[PDB]
């Protein structure tokens, strides 16, 4: 068992799913621009579309790993890790929350293997810091 | 191999000799790569001037 | 009067308070006019007193600090939580002294009854009360000089290179 | 004693003083505070 | 060998629970240590050890060995 | 500069703007404060360049603010002007050696004018020694080097807020006017639609009463504030009328008890709000109020005005009504909306200059109060400016600020990066800020206005998370304290070369593109669907016509320390944060080595940090030695530079500078002449390159541990020099002074062997725990000895000397040679404090090699403690006999979501081996030929910018074209995995293993400083428990949770002994020690002292605590 | 009642009541939890060669923790004549002192603890053995019980003295008798 | 109100306490060693 | 039970797999067991 960037295999079918749901997103954006839907309708439709895309990519990823992959062997045996983290590493990171607790209707369509752009990294820092602060306070609350 | 030194105007490793470009703690690293062979079972001594 | 008699935790009489106030006033005036901190010699000459007196007057006016002043950013301790108690019984020293006492009693036992008794009653080991030579002679019914003779003999006996090493370490 | 050592020390003490409450030292915290064997585990008189 | 000897399961066959075994072994160890300390001086009621020992063995280990072998009895007072 | 070491870069984007002077944030502020010639050039260089409007230096502004000073009658006046500075009396080196405070004298031209006969008494007044700031943005206070960090505060102004009550299900509005140095006023509309005018948080009045007091009649209010029913309802529910009646009502409500009067109320209100002496919102406050409400009142002076009050009331009532836009005074129109208190449009930055100005102003307030009081009380015609001005308060305030202030911090000097990051730090807590425990979860968030102004990655991981941050690389501080960022202007879809500095509000106004936007190369966007940021910070796709700004470059949002992590975009935010926070703890090793695969930000950081010696004027090096470099400049003058050698930093490390030039070389200005503590040829180098293999190895690297090779100990790869200083002073006592000498009363002569003539250890001597460094004797006077001691003395005849020893000895567990001895005598003119005859300092230095227990870590948040150091022979070695220097567990990579380290390792191997890809007509090979990265000699360093690094395609392709080794084979297969051999068994490992070169740092968490044990030692004073800490011996605390665990096991005797005969049983500690030493039974515990102290305190509170026995009889506890 | 009095620095004075209340009063800081003697602390490393009931103490910490016992033992073996010479010999750090320490340390359990102590398996008794270094060695299996990682964590060592304390630490708190978890009954001392 | 009052009125009715203990004529003084006046090195005194 | 609780109602001791002894401090064990997982419960 070893880790090399060639072991982290992103599914080969991610491109097609992402492209199709990007076409759907563009269609909804055009519909909103003309004026046949309000803002909340666009937000909810995009959130649903990208949740579906994330689930499809996760399923393809799960079906793609060979049974002898070092990372799949680490996760399957129960030694360490779980499936959400391996989805984030090789797949689609998904939807993230805003500075205020509310989903941003524009997902991070790139995994940590393919590298995030500047805006995606900035968006992820929000949840990162919120989780860190919650971890900081949980200790005192549980102690009391 | 070499096992110890002593310089004319030096008391410890953490100092410098007037006139040389290296600290006394870099001369030590430079003479650690000094490959020598010896035949005497006693601690022979050689001189650099 | 009341301020001089009630403004300090460690009270200072009125005259010494006056001296301290005058010294502070002179020092402040010298700092203002000259623009530099006055050295002790300048104050001594201006105030017409020895430099040691100026130093003592400076040391008298200091006010105490508190043991409850916080020192850490978090605030988990006070200034009085790291003051080592320099007048407690260190258990190692106490046990060492007890062992020394036991060893001394054991060594003094090897001597004769008379010599050990005179040493004990001369250094007051049993009661802690030193006694004069004449009283020791009275109890022993001998001359004072004779008693002095016995003490020297035992003192040299213990300080010999045959019985000293049992007591050298404890010194 | 236990209530005072928990929290609201001033209120607990000013109430106990007026009520003249007497502590019998039957818990764990009281024995821990005063420095004797807790009435649990090996500190029970059945085992000692 | 070491601190896992004798096994706890075998020891617990001689008492009721761990809590009583602790006091049983501790009292026996104190008796053995007192016997060693005052062995030279005048004789006292203390006895033991009842088993083969080592050069400088912890009295608690000897007490546990004696308890396991079945050379002691605990009453109630 | 052009004289930088080679580093082949993988960047594909051309940056149009260079990073600014990273130290400007402090130097520029202090230059403004002083009024230096540099600030004069900057302000004169404001010819349509920069926001350098303020023409007044800080001290000039303060003096002009405090002038003129007049008495209650105006008979005479006093004024200050034309502040001047004299050269400093001591250099930095002298100040640090002798523990001075590097500063300069300050003179003020003060003139006293008497209105009778027209007198003028202009003269010079000395206003104390003003501390100066070095060229590195640091102060030298009392010999120690300090840093003043900026502060993030809430800018003064008017803020409108709304809240919703879950119970009443109605919205409640509020409006505050928060000044600087003033009294607040807050209006609020509650569920009852009543316009409360809460004043100075004093209960709750009605705005109608205040309006009537201000001089408004009911008819005017009705005809003006009529369209909105809330204020009509407030008016009807008044039951009062008349200006005098309302004014007296207000005074009675807010100042009850005193005899009400009309004049008292008016004067009180004017003093509260309209008096500039006790209320002054600064230029920022006036600017913000004008911007929000539209009033174009001049910024020359700011004091609350009635017009502002009515404007605020109008704004609040319109906002509550439901309006969205409004007509504003002296403006076209304004938008009605609530304010976000976290937006950097509302949060400003108080830099060093502003803080020092505030302290100087506070001192000058008392100074002028004293001046006016003494001017009034004393006589006239015999008074001159020199005898009126008392400068004690000013210097006292300056000293108070520079010492015992939360913003004047003891500098961090682990390495150049730590020092540079200590500056450029924005702290949101401190005097006038907020508190650690009161900050909520909304002020610690990453607000979308932090982009390009504050880093979102670098923050402390403790309970300070979010309250301390770092300024972004391109960030700049406005004239009013706000933070600006640069953007390239794009017009008609064409990206021009005009850079505009934009603040948070202007950023909200526009739509900003993204840094890496593919272009047709004719300065025009390509894809027609560009991801851009919009008003609310939301990202959206837009066409290339709406865009009007673009980012200057990628990595515009990441701080200086976060821009040195290669492959940052492949790392989770948490791991990047940890790596950034953990790169500041690496220690400087004896031999430095720049990273093999780094970013482009090492040279700039190392040179701008100020720890690298740089040539001042071009010339040719004349003479060179490890202690100095003398260069003959071109203009005929010669200059000699000195280098620090084995100095000591604040943190105990060693500062040592190498020389990188030769005798015959030629140097241009800005060229690097000497390295720094942790630099190699000019660029930052915090660690070493080690050959790493990813695999579990017999469990020695289990659960984050690390296995090392013995080579790293043989060649001092991870060895560092550490220095400590020990200080002892001979002072005066009641029974005479103390003396320093080698005539110690009773010490075997062998100890006094390395001591010199005056009883101070010799330079070059090696010391071990218990050795004597300085020999000191303290008199003790008459004492009575115990009978046994006297008898023993009589035996051995050793007369007592009456003076005991207090010599200085090395603490327990310390070793090393003696580097330096510095001795100060009070009788040699040294400025020792009162009652300190002599002082002496001894420096001990030792070289530490890496050993198990020492903590190592990388740049991607991967840390661990060395748990094994194997011989070279039994290490997994490549097919050509090359052992690996470090073994890391792979199980930690995936679950932690930082694949960046694997990529760094692959690229490090590629850089180490070198490659040659020139004739390849391959897609990925073409991108390499357009940037000049075709042929790379083995061992060359490479650069992958933060967000524009090397794509995986290029790495995969290059891995197949490396230079074959001496045997004509490539050891690493195209999948990145090599084929290793087992060091011990000798058989090859079943499958290929991933190997490469990783950059490893040596953190400052060495096990030498962590170990500490105790059997017995010092004890506390009031309660007799052990003395916690490590400067003492100190016992480990046994808290509540441990007590609960022991109770849960059911172990009562262990707990009882842990609580009685180990901490508090005063008479039991000695008894147990004696029992152990004599080999017998441990005695029974007693009663702890803390219980007795508690009972004594309770009895002192007039409580009748008593302990009862079986029968109702007290015990009395002795 | 009213405004508190203040001394230098304008900080409120401490009264009799303030000494009994709060997280830093007599009741909570000095009575329920105290500092103890015969205790040490250090960073933990991993030793996979140990058994489930063994721990590795650095010889400096072991020597400083067992000082009275080693002094008495080396007085017994005539390596010294009296406790004074024995104490000096131990302090100066001779060679035979460690040979004696290796045998006075046998069959003497030590309590290992890691703060925070969330449950009773956070304190466990191990049999010590000397190791060459400045870091403690912890069996890999007990980590889960301690929630202890090897990225800079530290642990504390306490020394039972009396026969009752030793019997408790040996029979009740031993490391190899605590496989199961009190919360639900599932093993925690398991390969992870 | 009467129920609340009776709780404090009843306590003194039966127990050995008396209301007069709520007003002090003499004030106790804690032993000096619990409010130490320690002399730091250099002559500075620290109080409690 | 007149005094406290009794072993048979408490049942087996999950930490040892046998009937709970007659001196066990079940209250502190319950408190610790309930409170330990507090940090895992994401707020
Ligand atoms: Mg850890």
Residues 6+ apart with CB under 8 A from F142: F99, F100, F101, F403
Q: How many CB pairs under 8 A join D and H?
A: 11
Sign of the Cα pseudo-torsion (F96, F98, F100, F102, in order): negative
**Residues near F60 by Cβ (< 8 Å), separated by ≥ 6?**
F35, F83
- Sheet strands side by side (includes H38-39): C65-66, H45-47, H38-39
| Alpha carbon of F896 to ligand 1 centroid (Å) | 14
Radius of gyration of chain H (CA): 21
Q: How many CB atoms lie within 10 A of CB C132?
A: 11
Q: Report CA Rg, chain C.
A: 30
Q: Are G45 and F864 in contact (CB under 8 A)?
A: no
d(CA F526, CA F515): 14
Say which of G9, G14, G84 has its CB closest to residue C96: G84
Please give the distance, rounded to the nearest whole angstrom, from the Cα atom of residue F185 to the centre of ligand 1: 50
Mutate to test the interface with I, among D28, D40, D48 (most CBs of I within 10 A): D40
* CB–CB contact F1044 I32 (8 Å): yes
Return the exposure string of F831-855: e unless at least 16 CB atoms fall within 10 Å of the residue's CB, then b: ebeebebbbbbbbbbbbbebbbbbb
CA angle C39, C43, C49 (to 5 degrees): 130
What is the C-alpha separation between F717 and F866, in angstroms, rounded?
A: 15
CA angle F672, F673, F675 (to 5 degrees): 80
Distance CA(F1033)–CA(F720), nearest Å, equals: 27
If you measure from the C-alpha of residue G155 to the centroid of ligand 1, how many angstroms do you get, rounded to a whole number?
A: 11
Question: Could I41 and A138 be called an inter-chain contact, meaning their C-beta atoms sit closer than 8 Å?
Answer: yes
Give yes or no for a contact between F106 and F130, defined as CB atoms under 8 angstroms apart: yes
| C110 contact partners, CB below 8 Å, separation of at least 6 | C163
Q: Is F426 within 8 Å of F470 (Cβ atoms)?
A: yes
Provide the 8-state DSSP code for B20: -
- How close, in Å, is residue F657 to chain D by CA atoms? 58
- Across the interface, of C59, C62, C66, the residue whose CB is closest to H47 is C66
Is the Cβ of C89 closer than 8 Å to some Cβ of chain H? no
CA of G148 to the centre of ligand 1 (A): 6
Cα F1046–chain centre separation: 42
Quick check: do A and H touch, 3+ CB pairs under 8 A?
no
Q: What angle do CA F948, F954, F956 make, to 5 degrees?
A: 130
Taking CB atoms and an 8 Å cutoff, what residues of chain D touch F1098?
A: 13
What secondary structure, in 3-state letters, does F514-545 show? CCCCCECCCCCECCCCEEEECCCCCEEEECCC
Q: In this structure, are residues F478 and F51 in contact, taking their beta carbons and an 8 Å threshold? A: yes
CA distance F822 to F1024: 39
Q: Which residue has the tokens 């009363």?
A: F745
What is the DSSP pairing of strand F942-943 with strand F597-598?
parallel
The runs of H, that is alpha helices, within chain G are 59-65, 67-76, 83-92, 96-104, 143-146, 163-171
Does G180 contact chain I (CB < 8 Å)? yes
Of A24, A95, A83, A9, which Cα lies nearest the Cα of A54? A95
F703 Cα to the center of ligand 1, angstroms: 10
G28 touches chain C (CB under 8 A): no
Q: Give the distance from residue A11's alpha carbon to the nearest chain I alpha carbon, in angstroms.
A: 31
Q: Is the dihedral of CA G157, G161, G165, G170 positive or negative?
A: positive
Q: What is the 3-state secondary structure (H, E, C) of F691-738?
A: EEEECCCCCCCCCCCEEEECHHHHCCCCCEEEEEEEEEEEEEECCEEC
The alpha-carbon gap from F615 to the nearest alpha carbon of chain H, in Å, equals 48
Indicate the residue of F1026, F1044, F1051 with minimum beta-carbon distance to G172: F1051
Q: Do E19 and D48 touch (CB under 8 A)?
A: no
Coil, helix or strand at residue F383: coil
Long-range pairs of F625-633 with CB within 8 A, sequence gap ≥ 24: F625/B18, F625/B19, F625/B20, F625/B21, F626/B16, F626/B17, F626/B20, F626/B21, F626/B22, F626/B23, F626/F659, F627/B16, F627/B18, F629/F659, F629/F661, F629/F673, F629/F674, F631/F667, F631/F673
Chains with ≥3 Cβ pairs under 8 A against F? A, B, C, D, E, G, H, I
Residue extents of the structural domains in chain A: 13-133
Give me the half-sphere count of Cα atoms (radius 13 Å) on the Cβ side of residue D40.
26
In this complex, do C91 and F1016 lie within 8 Å of one another by their Cβ atoms? yes
Resolution of this model in Å is 3.1
Count CA atoms within 13 Å of residue C134 on its CB side. Answer: 0
User: Would an 8 Å CB–CB cutoff place I24 in contact with chain D?
Assistant: yes
Which whole-number Å values give the CA distances from G124 to F282, F320, F918, F1054, G120, in the listed order?
63, 64, 64, 13, 8
Residues of H in contact with F1102 (CB under 8 A): 24, 27-28
Q: Is F751 on the interface with G (CB under 8 A)?
A: no
Neighbouring-strand partners of residue G55: G128
Technique that determined the structure: cryo-EM
H14 at the D interface (CB within 8 A)?
no
- Burial label for C89, CB within 10 Å (0-12, 13-18, 19+), is middle
Q: How far apart are CA F635 and CA F617, in angstroms?
A: 9
CB contact under 8 A, D41 and E19: yes
Whole-number Å distance, alpha carbon F446 to ligand 1 midpoint, is 27
Cα dihedral F9, F15, F16, F19, rounded to 10, equals -90
Measured in angstroms, how far is the CA atom of residue C73 from the centroid of ligand 1? 24
Q: Is H38 on the interface with F (CB under 8 A)?
A: yes
Is G69 in the F-facing interface, judged by CB distances under 8 Å?
yes
Tokens representing F679 are: 């630099």
Q: What's the farthest any 2 CA atoms get from each other in chain D?
A: 39
Q: What are residue F737's DSSP bridge partners?
A: F732
CB-CB under 8 Å, D28 with I23: no
| Fold that domain A13-133 belongs to in CATH | Topoisomerase I; Chain A, domain 4 (1.10.132)
Rounded to whole angstroms, how far apart are CA atoms F281 and F292? 15
Residues of chain G with Cβ-Cβ distance to F1046 below 8 Å are: 123
Whether the CB of H17 is below 8 Å from some CB of chain D: the reply is: yes
């Amino acid at each position: 068992v070893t880790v090399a960037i060639s072991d982290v295999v992103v599914p080969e079918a991610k491109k097609a799913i992402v492209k199709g749901y990007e076409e759907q997103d563009e269609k909804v954006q055009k519909q909103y621009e003309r004026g046949l839907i309000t803002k909340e309708e666009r937000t909810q439709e995009l959130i649903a579309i990208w949740t579906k895309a994330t689930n499809e990519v996760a399923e393809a990823m799960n079906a793609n790993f060979p049974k002898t992959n070092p990372i799949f062997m680490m996760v399957d045996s129960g030694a360490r890790g779980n499936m959400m983290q391996m989805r984030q590493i090789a797949g689609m990171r998904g939807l993230v929350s805003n500075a205020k607790n509310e989903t941003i209707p524009r997902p991070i369509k790139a995994s940590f293997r393919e590298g995030l752009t500047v805006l995606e990294y900035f968006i992820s820092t929000h949840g990162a810091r919120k989780g860190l602060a919650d971890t900081a306070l949980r200790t005192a609350d549980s102690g009391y | 191999a070499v096992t110890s030194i002593r310089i004319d105007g030096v008391l410890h490793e953490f100092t410098t000799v007037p006139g040389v470009k290296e600290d006394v703690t870099d001369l030590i690293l430079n003479i650690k790569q000094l490959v020598v062979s010896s035949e005497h079972d006693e601690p022979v001594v050689m001189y650099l001037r | 009067r009341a301020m001089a008699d009630q403004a300090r935790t460690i009270r200072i009489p009125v005259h010494m308070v006056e001296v301290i106030n005058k010294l502070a006033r002179v020092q402040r005036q010298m700092l203002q006019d000259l623009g530099r901190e006055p050295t002790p010699e300048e104050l001594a000459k201006e105030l017409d007193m020895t430099p040691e007196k100026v130093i003592e007057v400076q040391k008298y006016g200091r006010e105490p600090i508190s043991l409850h002043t916080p020192l850490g950013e978090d605030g988990d301790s006070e200034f009085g939580d790291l003051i080592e108690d320099s007048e407690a019984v260190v258990p190692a020293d106490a046990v060492s002294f007890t062992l020394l006492q036991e060893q001394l009693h054991s060594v003094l036992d090897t001597l004769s009854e008379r010599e050990a008794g005179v040493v004990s009653m001369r250094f007051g080991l049993t009661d802690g009360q030193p006694k004069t030579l004449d009283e020791i002679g009275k109890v022993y019914g001998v001359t004072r000089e004779r008693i002095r003779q016995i003490e020297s003999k035992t003192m040299s006996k213990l300080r010999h290179p045959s019985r000293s090493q049992v007591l050298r370490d404890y010194l | 004693l236990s209530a005072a050592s928990f929290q609201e020390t001033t209120r607990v003490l000013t109430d106990a003083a007026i009520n003249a409450k007497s502590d019998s030292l039957i818990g764990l915290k009281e024995n821990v505070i005063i420095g004797k064997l807790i009435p649990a585990g090996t500190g029970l008189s059945r085992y000692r | 060998e070491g601190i896992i000897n004798p096994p706890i399961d075998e020891l617990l066959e001689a008492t009721d629970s761990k809590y009583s075994l602790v006091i049983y072994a501790a009292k026996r160890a104190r008796q053995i240590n007192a016997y060693y300390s005052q062995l030279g001086e005048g004789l006292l009621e203390y006895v033991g050890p009842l088993v083969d020992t080592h050069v400088h063995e912890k009295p608690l280990s000897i007490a546990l060995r004696e308890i396991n072998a079945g050379l002691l009895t605990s009453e109630a007072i | 500069a052009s004289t930088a070491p080679l580093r082949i870069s993988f960047a594909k984007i051309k940056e149009p703007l260079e990073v600014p002077n990273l130290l400007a944030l402090q130097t520029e502020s202090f230059d403004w404060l002083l009024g230096n010639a540099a600030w004069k050039a900057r302000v004169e260089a404001a010819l349509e360049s920069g926001q350098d409007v303020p023409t007044k230096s800080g001290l000039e502004e303060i003096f002009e603010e405090i002038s003129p000073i007049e008495d209650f009658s105006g008979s005479m006046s006093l004024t200050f002007r034309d502040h001047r500075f004299e050269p400093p009396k001591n250099s930095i080196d002298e100040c640090k050696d002798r523990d001075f405070t590097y500063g300069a004298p300050l003179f003020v031209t003060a003139e006293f004018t008497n209105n009778e006969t027209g007198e003028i008494k202009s003269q010079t007044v000395f206003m104390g020694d003003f501390p100066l700031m070095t060229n590195k943005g640091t102060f030298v206070i009392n010999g120690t080097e300090r840093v003043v960090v900026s502060q993030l505060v809430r800018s003064p102004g008017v803020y409108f807020d709304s809240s919703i009550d879950k119970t009443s299900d109605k919205d409640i509005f509020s409006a505050k006017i928060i000044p600087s140095r003033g009294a607040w006023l807050e209006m609020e509309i509650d569920k009852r639609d009543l316009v409360g005018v809460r004043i100075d948080r004093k209960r709750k009045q009605s705005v109608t009463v205040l309006l009537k007091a201000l001089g408004w009649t009911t008819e005017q209010i009705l005809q003006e504030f009529g369209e909105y029913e809330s204020m009509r309802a407030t008016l009807e529910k008044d039951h009062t009328q008349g200006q005098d009646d309302a004014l007296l009502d207000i005074y009675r409500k807010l100042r009850p008890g005193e005899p009400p009067t009309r004049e008292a109320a008016q004067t009180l209100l004017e003093n509260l709000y309209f008096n500039p002496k006790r209320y002054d919102l600064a230029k920022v406050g006036r600017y913000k109020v004008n911007k929000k409400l539209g009033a174009d009142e001049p910024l020359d002076a700011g004091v609350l005005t009635t017009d502002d009050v009515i404007a605020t009331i109008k704004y609040l009532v319109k906002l509550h009504a439901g309006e969205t836009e409004t007509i504003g005074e002296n403006g076209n129109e304004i938008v009605v909306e609530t304010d976000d208190i976290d937006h950097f449009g509302n949060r400003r930055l108080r830099n060093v200059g502003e803080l020092i100005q505030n302290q100087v102003r506070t001192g000058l307030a008392r100074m002028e109060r004293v001046v006016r009081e003494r001017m009034t009380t004393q006589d006239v015609e015999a008074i001159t400016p020199q005898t009126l001005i008392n400068i004690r308060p000013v210097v006292a305030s300056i000293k108070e600020f520079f010492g015992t202030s939360q913003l004047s911090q003891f500098m961090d000097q682990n390495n150049p990066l730590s020092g540079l990051t200590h500056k450029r730090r924005l702290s949101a807590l401190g005097p006038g800020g907020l508190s650690r425990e009161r900050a909520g979860f909304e002020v610690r968030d990453v607000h979308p206005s932090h982009y390009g102004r504050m880093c979102p990655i670098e923050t402390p991981e403790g309970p300070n998370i979010g309250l301390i941050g770092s300024l972004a690389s391109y960030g700049r501080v406005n004239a009013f304290g706000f933070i600006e960022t640069p953007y390239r202007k794009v017009v008609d879809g064409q990206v021009t070369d005009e850079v505009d500095y934009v603040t948070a509000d202007e950023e909200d106004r526009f739509v900003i593109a993204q840094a890496n936007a593919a272009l047709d190369e004719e300065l025009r966007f390509s894809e027609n669907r560009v991801l851009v940021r919009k008003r609310g910070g939301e990202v959206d796709y837009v066409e290339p016509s709406d865009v009007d700004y673009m980012d200057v470059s990628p990595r515009q949002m990441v701080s200086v320390a976060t821009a040195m992590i290669p492959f940052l975009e492949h790392d989770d935010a948490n791991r990047a944060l940890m790596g950034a926070n953990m790169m500041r703890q690496a220690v400087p090793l004896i031999k430095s080595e720049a990273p093999l695969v780094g970013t482009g930000m090492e040279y700039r950081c190392a040179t701008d940090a100020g720890d690298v010696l740089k040539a001042e004027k071009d010339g040719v090096v004349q003479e060179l030695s490890a202690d100095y470099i003398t260069v003959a400049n071109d203009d005929g003058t010669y200059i000699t530079y000195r280098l620090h050698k084995f100095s000591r930093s604040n943190q105990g490390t060693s500062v040592n500078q190498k020389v990188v030039v030769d005798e015959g070389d030629r140097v241009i200005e800005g060229q690097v002449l000497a390295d720094g503590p942790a630099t190699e040829d000019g660029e930052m180098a915090l660690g070493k390159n080690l050959l790493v293999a990813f695999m579990p190895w017999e469990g020695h690297n289990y659960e984050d541990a690390i296995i090392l090779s013995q080579r790293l100990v043989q060649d001092d790869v991870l060895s560092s020099i550490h220095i400590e200083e020990h200080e002892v002073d001979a002072r005066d006592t009641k029974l005479g002074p103390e003396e320093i000498t080698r005539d110690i009363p009773n010490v075997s002569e062998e100890v006094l062997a390395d001591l010199d003539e005056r009883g101070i250890i010799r330079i070059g001597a090696e010391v071990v725990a218990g050795d004597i460094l300085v020999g000191k004797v303290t008199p003790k006077g008459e004492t009575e000895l115990t009978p046994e001691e006297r008898l023993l003395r009589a035996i051995f005849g050793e007369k007592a000397r009456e003076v005991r020893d207090t010599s200085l000895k090395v603490p327990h567990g310390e070793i090393g040679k003696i580097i330096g001895v510095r001795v100060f005598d009070r009788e040699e003119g040294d400025e020792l404090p009162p009652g300190v005859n002599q002082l002496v300092r001894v420096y001990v230095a030792q070289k530490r090699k890496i050993t198990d227990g020492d903590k190592l870590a990388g740049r991607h948040g991967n840390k661990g403690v060395i748990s094994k150091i194997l011989p070279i022979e039994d290490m997994p070695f490549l097919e050509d006999g090359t052992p690996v220097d470090i073994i890391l567990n792979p199980l930690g990579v995936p679950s932690r979501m930082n694949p960046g380290q694997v990529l760094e390792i692959h690229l490090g191997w590629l850089a180490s081996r070198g490659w040659d890809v020139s004739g390849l007509a391959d897609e990925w090979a073409q991108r390499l030929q357009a940037i000049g990265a075709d042929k790379v000699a083995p061992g060359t360093n490479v650069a992958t910018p933060v967000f524009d690094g090397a794509r995986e395609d290029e790495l995969a392709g290059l891995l197949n074209h490396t230079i074959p080794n001496r045997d004509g084979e490539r050891m690493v297969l195209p999948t990145g995995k090599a084929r290793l051999f087992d060091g011990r068994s000798g058989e090859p490992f079943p499958d290929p293993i991933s190997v490469g070169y990783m950059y490893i740092l040596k953190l400052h968490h060495l096990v030498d400083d962590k170990l500490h044990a105790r059997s017995t030692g010092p004890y506390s004073m009031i309660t007799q428990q052990p003395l916690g800490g490590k400067a003492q011996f100190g016992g480990q605390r046994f808290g509540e949770m441990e007590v609960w665990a022991l109770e849960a096991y059911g172990a009562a005797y262990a707990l009882q002994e842990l609580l009685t005969i180990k901490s508090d049983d005063v008479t039991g500690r000695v008894k147990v020690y004696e029992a152990i030493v004599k080999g017998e039974n441990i005695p029974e515990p007693g009663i702890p002292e803390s219980f007795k102290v508690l009972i004594k305190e309770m009895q002192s509170l007039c409580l009748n605590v008593e302990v009862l026995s079986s029968d109702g009889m007290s015990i009395e506890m002795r | 009642r009213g405004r508190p009095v203040t001394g230098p620095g304008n900080r409120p004075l401490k009264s009799l009541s303030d000494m009994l209340k709060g997280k830093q009063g007599r009741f909570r800081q000095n009575l329920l939890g105290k500092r103890v003697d015969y205790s040490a602390r250090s960073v933990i490393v991993v030793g996979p060669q140990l058994k489930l009931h063994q721990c590795g103490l650095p010889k400096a910490m072991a020597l400083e923790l067992f000082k009275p016992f080693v002094m008495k033992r080396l007085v017994d073996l005539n390596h010294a004549q009296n406790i004074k010479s024995a104490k000096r010999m131990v302090e100066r750090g001779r060679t035979v002192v460690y040979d004696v320490l290796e045998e006075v340390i046998a069959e003497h359990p030590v309590l290992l603890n890691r703060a925070p102590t969330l449950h009773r398996l956070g304190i466990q008794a191990f049999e010590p053995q000397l190791v060459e270094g400045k870091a403690i060695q912890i069996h890999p299996l007990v980590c889960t019980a301690f929630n202890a990682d090897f990225d800079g964590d530290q642990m504390a060592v306490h020394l039972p003295l009396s026969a009752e304390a030793q019997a408790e630490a040996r029979i009740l708190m031993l490391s190899s008798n605590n496989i199961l978890k009190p919360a639900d009954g599932r093993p925690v001392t398991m390969p992870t | 109100r009467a129920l609340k009052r009776l709780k404090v009125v009843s306590a003194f009715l039966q127990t050995a306490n008396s209301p007069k203990g709520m007003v002090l004529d003499c004030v106790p003084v804690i032993p000096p060693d619990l409010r130490p006046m320690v002399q730091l090195d250099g002559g500075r005194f620290a109080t409690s | 039970s007149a005094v406290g609780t009794c072993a048979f109602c408490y049942g087996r001791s999950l930490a040892t797999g046998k009937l709970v002894d007659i001196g066990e401090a079940v209250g502190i064990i319950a408190a610790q067991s309930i409170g330990e997982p507090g940090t895992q419960l994401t707020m």
